[PDB]
């Protein structure tokens, strides 16, 4: 039925222009900050990855939407920004602005994290209230010409279990049933599936300076935007950290609703980051006892602190060997790698974050009422007896240690 195919195509195009598909939550559903996909993150940096060995320079949208291949996989890390890219593609098709997507008659944006039963059920309940004129199981029979006309965008693969909907796994695995275009978003844990298909692999990189500036100016009152964009010129640490989305949407979120600009200090930016990181997942964290959760985080703390003294930032799987590795990974404190160039190992969000983490742990030891913890705290400070090292290797650690506590500061200054 051409009449139904035309209405379906029109409904998809209009759906992707509605606010319900554009109003995005950059921090979480708990914190009521809403960004419009039309004005926010617009210019992603993608790399074409070959066998983990990077290989080639950046592939931008439109270009990557022309150089399409059999089913492709796009991957993030441990959870930085969110999968806004797939939504952006659907938007571009719906507007018709980009000719790269003009050849497509249908584009379906799906969330695999909220899918079950089958394809028709998922599309009907998740995307559009598709009528019984289409849902006769005759749709695919006539659609079959879709090989070069239909694009499926699948988010949250890492949140989807194949038993929930065998059709999804069967199609994403085989694909040749429709021979259509498929783009699916995954995480590093999904490297276990990526290398099994031979699929083109797209890596999401960092932000450009212009992108970070654009967000500051677009979603922050002028007076505060002008202040923040000056502070970023004075501090080299911010210029590097601002390349990562979670340090862009936070460094401005803390000033939303304010009337005056404050520099804050880059100890509270990490504190805010840390607190949110261990709270946004507090529901899924229920899989671990609250006391065990604390122990896991304390372990991570000690690892970071030892790492600073040992001059190491890369932790091998066996270095962590804490059992509650899943807890730290669920939290997002560590990023897991299983790549050939990254045999099972963990890294911190950022080098300076590991230093923050170490600082937070050292201060919590020093301020503990238990003499064993205090002794350990002093044991770490005791090693710092060298002006040339204090002003270098341990400078960052001491700054975070003091920033987190007055009592920790007392211990530090008496030593120094």
């Amino acid at each position: 039925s051409e009449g139904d195919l035309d209405d379906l195509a029109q409904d998809l195009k209009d759906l992707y222009h509605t606010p319900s598909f554009l109003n995005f939550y950059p921090l979480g559903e708990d914190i009521d900050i809403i960004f419009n996909l039309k004005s926010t993150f617009t210019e992603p940096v993608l790399w074409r990855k070959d066998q983990h060995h990077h290989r080639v320079e950046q592939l931008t949208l439109n270009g990557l939407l022309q150089a399409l291949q059999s089913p492709c996989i796009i991957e993030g890390e441990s959870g930085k920004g969110k999968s806004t890219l797939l939504q952006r593609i659907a938007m571009l098709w719906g507007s018709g602005k980009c000719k790269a997507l003009t050849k497509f008659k249908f584009v379906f944006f799906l969330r695999l994290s909220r899918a079950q039963g089958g394809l028709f059920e998922t599309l009907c309940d998740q995307l559009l209230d598709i009528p019984g004129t289409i849902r006769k199981q005759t749709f695919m029979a006539m659609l079959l010409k879709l090989r070069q006309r239909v694009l499926f965008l699948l988010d949250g693969y890492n949140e989807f279990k194949p038993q929930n909907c065998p059709e999804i796994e069967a199609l994403i695995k085989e694909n040749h049933r429709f021979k259509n275009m498929v783009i699916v978003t995954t995480t590093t844990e999904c490297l276990r599936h990526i290398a099994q298909f031979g699929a083109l692999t797209a890596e999401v990189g960092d932000m450009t300076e212009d992108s970070a500036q654009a967000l500051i100016r677009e979603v922050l009152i002028k007076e505060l935007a002008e202040g923040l964009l000056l502070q970023i010129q004075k501090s080299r640490c911010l210029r590097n950290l601002m390349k990562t989305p979670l340090f862009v949407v936070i460094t401005c979120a803390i000033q939303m609703g304010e009337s005056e600009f404050h520099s804050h200090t880059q100890t509270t930016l990490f504190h805010t980051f840390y607190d949110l990181l261990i709270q946004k997942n507090k529901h899924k964290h229920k899989g671990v006892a609250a006391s065990d959760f604390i122990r896991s985080l304390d372990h991570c703390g000690d690892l970071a602190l030892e790492g600073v003294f040992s001059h190491k930032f890369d932790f091998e799987l066996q270095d962590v060997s804490s059992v509650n590795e899943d807890v730290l990974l669920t939290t997002g404190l560590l990023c897991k790698y299983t790549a050939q160039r990254f045999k099972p190992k963990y890294k911190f969000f950022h080098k300076s974050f590991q230093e923050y983490t170490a600082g937070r742990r050292l201060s919590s030891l020093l301020t503990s009422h238990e003499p064993e913890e205090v002794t350990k705290g002093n044991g770490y400070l005791q090693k710092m007896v060298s002006i040339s090292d204090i002003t270098s290797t341990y400078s960052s650690l001491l700054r975070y240690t003091c920033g987190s506590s007055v009592e920790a500061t007392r211990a530090v200054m008496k030593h120094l």
């Binding site: 409904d11 319900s20 109003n23 009521d32 809403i34 209230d129 979603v219 922050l220 939303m256 609703g257």
Partner: protein
């Protein structure tokens, strides 16, 4: 009202309608200054079903039971038709960018499209606003709204999340359980689309809504029915995801307060004159009359002592919290408890010059942020922020509550809760 014939250009009059008289001479004789008289001296199955529904709706909205919208709780009599000349201050805020612009009603009615929302503090007048819109449409003397063929004013106050539209409109808008069926209503909605407007009041949550209505919010692209939803700022986190911009109600302007008092009274000019002077010199106290509900509080007092030529500046607060007990009351353990806990918060805040509170400051005061009474005293702000905050209605009110709490502490016979009054007094 039985035999009251009112003049649109000067107010209620001609009580008991003198029999056999001539309205032109009676009007002139009684009010020989009325501008009107001065000017006078100088000079297709669903289609037919939809039509029948339209006529019934119009009759319901122009009837003298929808008009006289209990403004200021004057009475069931004493016509208040001439008091419907004051509007609210409306601004449009973007949900994303920090952008705000002022509006007037002629520029609001022309921008009604898909899903829109009106936000404000308790008592801001959002319920009167929605009724006024339905009234203008039914009258038909307001081009710009005349494009709508069906307008439904509904209150989602207790409606179960399984009731169909026919079962709702037949209860709240129509006289009897007839005229329409569920299939008739659905067939009409999908045919008129843009020409159907719902005014949904008393919105609480997305879950506790008729399924048939929830589907017009969540997926409003397969219908394009226009919805206008009124909420308190204590919520308004549930529907922001479906909006582009929000209409926000701002403080009710002092000049509207003056006009209302001038029209209702004027029999005691020596009291009204003092009112004008008082708020002339005390420029910041003009903020007391922020919410129309406070204006009602004054009127209620001024009708009890109509000939007492004095202005008591605290009378509005004593009245406001008295009428509070006549809304949805529970004197024992609720009204007393909410006032006491809020009073403690205010008392502490007024000696640190806070006038703004966070969630921990609120929690220690024993105030339940989800209670219904603690919304007529205080408002919550959850706007685009990393963390929410709370603020009392116009600050002069906070001082009043702080004063009230201090007295309770001093009078109480509990040493543990009495010496505290001295602690605060000695500040």
């Amino acid at each position: 009202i039985k035999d009251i014939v009112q003049c649109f250009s000067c107010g209620g009059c001609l009580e008991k309608w003198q029999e056999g008289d001539d309205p032109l001479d009676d009007h002139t004789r009684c009010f020989p200054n009325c501008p009107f008289l001065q000017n006078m001296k100088s000079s297709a199955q669903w289609f037919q079903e939809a039509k029948n529904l339209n006529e019934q709706l119009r009759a319901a909205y122009t009837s003298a039971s929808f008009r006289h919208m209990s403004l200021l709780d004057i009475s069931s009599d004493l016509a208040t038709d001439h008091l419907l000349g004051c509007d609210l201050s409306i601004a449009s805020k973007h949900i994303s960018k920090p952008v705000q612009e002022p509006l007037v009603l002629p520029e609001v009615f022309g921008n009604l499209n898909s899903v829109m929302c009106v936000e404000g503090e308790a008592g801001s007048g959002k319920t009167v606003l929605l009724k006024k819109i339905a009234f203008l449409w039914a009258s038909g003397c307001c081009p710009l709204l005349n494009r709508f063929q069906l307008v439904f004013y509904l209150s989602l106050s207790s409606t179960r999340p399984d009731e169909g539209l026919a079962s709702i409109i037949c209860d709240q808008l129509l006289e009897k359980e007839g005229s329409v069926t569920e299939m008739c209503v659905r067939n009409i909605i999908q045919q008129l689309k843009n020409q159907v407007l719902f005014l949904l009041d008393d919105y609480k949550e997305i879950c506790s809504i008729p399924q048939v209505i929830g589907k017009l919010i969540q997926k409003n692209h397969l219908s394009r029915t226009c919805l206008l939803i009124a909420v308190r700022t204590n919520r308004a986190r549930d529907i922001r995801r479906y909006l582009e911009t929000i209409l926000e109600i701002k403080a009710f302007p002092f000049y509207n307060t003056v006009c209302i008092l001038r029209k209702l009274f004027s029999h005691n000019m020596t009291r009204l004159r003092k009112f004008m002077v008082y708020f002339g010199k005390n420029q910041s106290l003009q903020k007391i009359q922020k919410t129309p509900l406070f204006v009602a509080a004054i009127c209620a007092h001024w009708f009890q002592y109509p000939f007492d030529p004095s202005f008591d500046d605290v009378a509005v607060f004593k009245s406001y919290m008295e009428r509070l007990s006549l809304r949805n009351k529970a004197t024992a353990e609720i009204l007393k408890a909410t006032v006491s806990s809020c009073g403690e918060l205010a008392l502490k805040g007024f000696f640190s010059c806070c006038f703004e509170f966070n969630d921990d400051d609120l929690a220690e005061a024993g105030v339940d942020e989800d209670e219904d009474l603690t919304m007529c005293l205080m408002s919550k702000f959850t706007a685009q922020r990393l963390r929410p905050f709370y603020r009392f209605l116009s600050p002069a009110f906070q001082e009043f509550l702080a004063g009230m709490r201090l007295i309770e502490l001093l009078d109480s016979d509990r040493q543990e809760h009495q010496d505290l009054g001295l602690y605060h007094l000695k500040q």
